[PDB]
């Protein structure tokens, strides 16, 4: 409970980092697709 309360900012930060990385990867993949079309 208290341990979960202390670890919740870390879990939220990790999830935010994961979402940021995944969005960046999808963005880069679409850019590579545009490069291949070119």
């Amino acid at each position: 409970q208290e341990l979960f309360n202390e670890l919740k900012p870390a879990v939220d930060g990790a999830n935010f980092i994961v979402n940021h990385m995944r969005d960046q990867n999808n963005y880069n993949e679409e850019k590579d697709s545009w490069n291949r079309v070119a």
Binding site: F4, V11, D12, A14, N15, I17, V18, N19, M21, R22, N25
Partner: peptide, 22 residues
């Protein structure tokens, strides 16, 4: 605590990040 969805999502996300950089 591992069964919490947020913890599991963070765990698989760290695995995904490592696989991506590999």
């Amino acid at each position: 605590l591992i069964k919490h969805p947020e913890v599991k999502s963070a765990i698989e996300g760290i695995k995904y990040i490592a696989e991506t950089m590999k």
